[PDB]
Design a protein around this nucleic acid. Sequence first.
RNA 1: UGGAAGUAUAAAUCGAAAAGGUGAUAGUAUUCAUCAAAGUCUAAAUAUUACAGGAAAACUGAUAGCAAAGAAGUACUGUGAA
RNA 2: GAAUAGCAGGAAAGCUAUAACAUGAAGAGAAAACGAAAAACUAUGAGAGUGUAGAAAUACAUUUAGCAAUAGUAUCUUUCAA
RNA 3: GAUUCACGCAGUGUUAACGUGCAAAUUACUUGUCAUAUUUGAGUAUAGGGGCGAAAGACUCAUCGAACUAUCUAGUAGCUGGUUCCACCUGAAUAUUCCCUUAGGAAGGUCAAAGUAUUAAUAGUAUUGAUUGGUAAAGAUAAUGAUUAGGUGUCAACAUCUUGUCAAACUAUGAAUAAACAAAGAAGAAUUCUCAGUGUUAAAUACACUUCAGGAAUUUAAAUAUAAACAUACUUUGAAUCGGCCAAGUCUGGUAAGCAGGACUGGCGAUGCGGGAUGAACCGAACGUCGAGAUAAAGUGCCAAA
RNA 4: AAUCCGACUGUUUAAUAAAAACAUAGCAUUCUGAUAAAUCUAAAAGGUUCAUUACAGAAUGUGAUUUCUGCCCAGUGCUCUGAAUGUCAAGGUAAUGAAAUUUACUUAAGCGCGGGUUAACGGCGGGAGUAACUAUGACUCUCUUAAGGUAGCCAAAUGCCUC
RNA 5: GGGAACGGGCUUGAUUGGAACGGCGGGGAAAGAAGACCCUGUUGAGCUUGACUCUAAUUUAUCAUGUGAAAU
RNA 6: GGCGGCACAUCUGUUACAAGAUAACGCAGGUGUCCAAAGAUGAACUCAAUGAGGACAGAAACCUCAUGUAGAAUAUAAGGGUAUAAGUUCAUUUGAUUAUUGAUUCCAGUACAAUCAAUAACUCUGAAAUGAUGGCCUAACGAUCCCUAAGAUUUUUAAUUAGAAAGAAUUUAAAACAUAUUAGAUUUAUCUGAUGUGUGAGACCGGUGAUUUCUAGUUAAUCCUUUAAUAAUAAGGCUUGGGGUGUCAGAAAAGUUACCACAGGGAUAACUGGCUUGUGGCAGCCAAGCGCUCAUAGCGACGUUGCUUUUUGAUCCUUCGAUGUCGGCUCUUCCUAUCCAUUUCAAGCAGAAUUGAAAAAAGGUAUGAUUGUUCACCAUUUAAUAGGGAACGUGAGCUGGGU
RNA 7: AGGUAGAUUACCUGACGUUCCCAUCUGUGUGAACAUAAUGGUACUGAUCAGGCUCUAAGCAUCUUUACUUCCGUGUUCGGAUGGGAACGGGUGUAUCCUACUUGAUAUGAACCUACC
RNA 8: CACCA
RNA 9: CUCUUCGAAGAAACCA
Length: 92
Amino acid sequence: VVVPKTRKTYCPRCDKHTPHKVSQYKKGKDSLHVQGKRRYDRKQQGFGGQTKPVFKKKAKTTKKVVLKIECTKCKYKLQKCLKRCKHFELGN
RNA sequence: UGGAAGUAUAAAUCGAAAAGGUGAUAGUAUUCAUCAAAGUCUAAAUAUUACAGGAAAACUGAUAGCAAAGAAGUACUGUGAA
RNA sequence: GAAUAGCAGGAAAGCUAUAACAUGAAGAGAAAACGAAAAACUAUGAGAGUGUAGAAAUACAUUUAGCAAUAGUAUCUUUCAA
RNA sequence: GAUUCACGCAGUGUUAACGUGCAAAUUACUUGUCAUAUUUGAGUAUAGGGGCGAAAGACUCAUCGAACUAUCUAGUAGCUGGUUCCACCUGAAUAUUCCCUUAGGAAGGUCAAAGUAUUAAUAGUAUUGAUUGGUAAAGAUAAUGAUUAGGUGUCAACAUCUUGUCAAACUAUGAAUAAACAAAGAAGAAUUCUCAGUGUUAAAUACACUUCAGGAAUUUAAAUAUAAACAUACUUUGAAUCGGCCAAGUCUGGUAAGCAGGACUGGCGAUGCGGGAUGAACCGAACGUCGAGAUAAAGUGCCAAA
RNA sequence: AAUCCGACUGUUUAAUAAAAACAUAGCAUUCUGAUAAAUCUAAAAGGUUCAUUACAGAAUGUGAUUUCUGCCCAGUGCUCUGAAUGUCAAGGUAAUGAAAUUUACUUAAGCGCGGGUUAACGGCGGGAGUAACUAUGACUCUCUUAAGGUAGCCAAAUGCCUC
RNA sequence: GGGAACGGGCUUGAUUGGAACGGCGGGGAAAGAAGACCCUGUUGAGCUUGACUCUAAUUUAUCAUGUGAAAU
RNA sequence: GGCGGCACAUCUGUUACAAGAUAACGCAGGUGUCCAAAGAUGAACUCAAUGAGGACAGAAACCUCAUGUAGAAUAUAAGGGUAUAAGUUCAUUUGAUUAUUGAUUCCAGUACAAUCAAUAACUCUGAAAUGAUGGCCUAACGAUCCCUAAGAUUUUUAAUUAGAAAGAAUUUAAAACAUAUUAGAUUUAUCUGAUGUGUGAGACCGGUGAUUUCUAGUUAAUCCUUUAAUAAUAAGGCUUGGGGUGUCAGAAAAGUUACCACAGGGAUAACUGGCUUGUGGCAGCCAAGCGCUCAUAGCGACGUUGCUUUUUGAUCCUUCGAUGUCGGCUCUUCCUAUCCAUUUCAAGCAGAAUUGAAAAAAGGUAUGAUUGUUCACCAUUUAAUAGGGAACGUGAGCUGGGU
RNA sequence: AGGUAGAUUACCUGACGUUCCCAUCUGUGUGAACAUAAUGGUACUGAUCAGGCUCUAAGCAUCUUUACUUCCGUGUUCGGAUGGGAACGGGUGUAUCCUACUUGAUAUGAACCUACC
RNA sequence: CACCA
RNA sequence: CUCUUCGAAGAAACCA
């Protein structure tokens, strides 16, 4: 919900408790050269229409929040998942 | 297509060479290996339920075995394919 | 009786072929890279004797053996993980 | 593109005949119509997601909301029907989990057949001992709620002492029936001596685990009842089945139901026999072929043995 | 003697419906200058209307005559002689990199915006006041989306209640 | 009467002489037809539509090198 | 069946039967969230309410004493738990973290998810013992494939120095041409023959030693693969999160058929029959009253007990390889809960006309306008113009008006 | 006898009063520093002037409560079993198990380690 | 607010 | 999900 930045948590690389910078994880841009997309492009060529299922029955109204707790002095990132919340804000 | 950043064919466009192709993960570089496309022919080993001529059978024995053991694709039906 | 090559006999049958390979002898890992002993231990257990007695068969005591199986262990190979 | 009759034609009515017919659409009377948007012969043109239609999804060789014919083709069916000799032995199911699952499947239970092990590997039972539960009951100024009245104190009110009646979603208390242990398996006990490795520990000779670490002597087969060696423990492979129905000194919905759905058991299904006249379930009792005898439920005026 | 439907002559479900159904003349709408419109074909110096030429060809609705066709362009259609940088493709250009690649800029129609159109598909309701006793509302106002059922006609082959 | 709750067969009764002719339409839950109403099936077909996925026709842009100028 | 609802994933009490399991479209409710504090810890305090007091101030404002077992609060539904707390206030903090095991709950003893017990790090709070791997407990949620993020420095190797200890290394037929040198030609991005050499070579004589190992440094490279060798991009691996399937063990999906078709079904509706009888119809018991007086001539409220299957329901037992489904016409028979005629009793029965009741079902119980109607409502006639059953009698008896 | 620590967690609680303090405990005095809050009331620290007034501890009462015992009462209910009776509803007999509320009688704590008296 | 029959 | 305007609209997009 309202979680702050500047967490002081354990860093596996340094084996110590160091200050961390907390942000939110956003899904990166889809690449056009990965195997799954390359395979999909070949399949969609030619006649046949839509060759793969298209999801059209969503039910979830929220998504799980994943923080990116990044070590300040060693750049070691940790991915921590939170419970489902409708409104999430990065505090002070 | 098993060939997966394209294995093969074809169409639209493009289009080489003081040669070059391939080493199946796309890219550039340097080595290595192995071949040298875009013309032609070529016996032998292989297939065969057309058809013809033979020989065999733990095959059937006239409601069986071919649809047909007699003038059987005959008699008979349909405008006709059948 | 892998194709296949020979033998007598004339044979869809029979016999002979130091043989490619198939399954197995070693297992784990996605892969690179690897690749098994403390010549094992503990428990219960199959069998064999000897003596005494009832007295017919058979029952008690003692010495020895420790297979199969089940469980638990030390050790060893591989894996991030047994 | 007036009114009518006739040769012809059609098909309004009888909802007549006929309806295994004269006929896979016909007959009789009645009616309408009977030349210019008329009737009709032959030739010719239009073909199956096509044609043709003054339009009915009508017609396209008795075939039309997509002709006929042959091939793919023995199309697919969780659905329906059938599935072929005898005797003997054993003998079921309707729970649970998942499925685009609900007329069907897979894991699992019941069951059969094969193959084993001397076997810390018997119990749908009772007793004794220590427990667990919150049902039936009971209670109601005992907690939570419901509810009738009467005294006393400062109309009512509020206190306080009685009184009558209550709860599936109230409870102090709390059975009967039940649930899970123990009644001597590191292998049938116990004691004495000796005793090590780790660790706990302030340190240990305490304590914990180590086959009641280990080793050796002495004593020893005892420790509720009952039953159990064709006992007990299974292992592997697999079939069928998961539409169920009935009874009740049981319950929930419903006015109730041969209604709907459950807890425990016994049955029917899969089951004949004796009795209830007859009856899937009730009562007695479960079946190799027979002879004789006592019996069961229930009967003994006749049918009908007594 | 009247009522309903169809104007009339005509056609129709071969074999249960001959009619109020179809057709019809009349009315009206749309597109097209012929190298066109419609439209058959896989293609085609291919084919039909077309031996044709707007008094024509092609595509539709209503259904003789008389009388009348009310209001609405908001939505969906169709159209425009409209605005440019709202959104829109492969491509084209440029930058980086060793190269693939990556990034940026620019591009048509279409939709969106604006206007026209109902004999185009269609729609024609609410709320608040108000007339000298009685209700109503000729007349104001006020949104939802645009308009608020006009001339007529009726328990109708169209009205549940309803005999 | 009970039974699958409407028997020709079973139980208990009523009652019965064998073969039949012309009629008739109560019964044989009479015949004709693997219900056509209803439901089920992960069975179809005709038709409709901004249901999903597509496609012919239509349309728009780029490519496919005629010369000779001129501007952008 | 549809429309409605979700009993489809899921939690609380009760049904539910004092172990476990446990039904219905049973009952009363709940979930798809919320929280940097409402997580962790330490300290202090005690809540609701009542009595008595205190200016405004009143029943509800704030203060004080006394009693005060929680009658308050604890995010939420309900049920559990809680008083030097789990509630209220203050203070510090991020354990709401990393890695590895073994179990328990659903369970097929699968996954997901949840609940725990330990070990190794690094931390928070407290003086300390302890406590902390989210919320006091029971719900608060998610596969394969695909996409998208985070992680794989600890260590293991090669090279060159310094030191040290162990090591003959296999054995006669040769082409690639890097080159040097000439010969024949050419001007071009110039080539074409042949002769030497090394390369490329390998047969050591107890000792040299090629070669491997060890130590200490130093330089480099380091998670695996892209299969002839490397390199920087790119791609694929391995582990763990997120993007979701609510039909919640997880297809990608609009209607209508009255023109319809097939496989089936009494597993299942529309008609009889069968159980029931709420509803309909009919009949009783009691006696508050009405009936000028008078409960009972005739009625009987408030309660209450029955019968029928002539209405409609409720159910789904028989029939889906078919039991012809409304009404009328024609015809026979049956029931009595009697409308008339016959015989009786009673009256608030003077006569007449009526009303209540008993025996009795052998005989009778009509004609028409409207409607397909059953039903109804009218106009008459009659001694009366009663109510019903027979597969809602009766379609190889008719009709076809309705459906 | 008292105080510290407890284990059983009402026979230990609650109300009305009563008895000592000789030690101990408590209440009692003060605010300088540690420390404390709005308040030296709490908590903290320094002390010993006085007091059994409260606490605490011991005892009383036809005391509420609580804990054992009988009785309630083999009454409620219950497991097994009829061709037992009843139209239903419900209720026997047989071989068995057996509460609760209430009322009456009793009790109102037992016990462990250390120090001091 | 009542669909099929 | 992108772009664009004033938590509402417009165009375009769509393999868990």
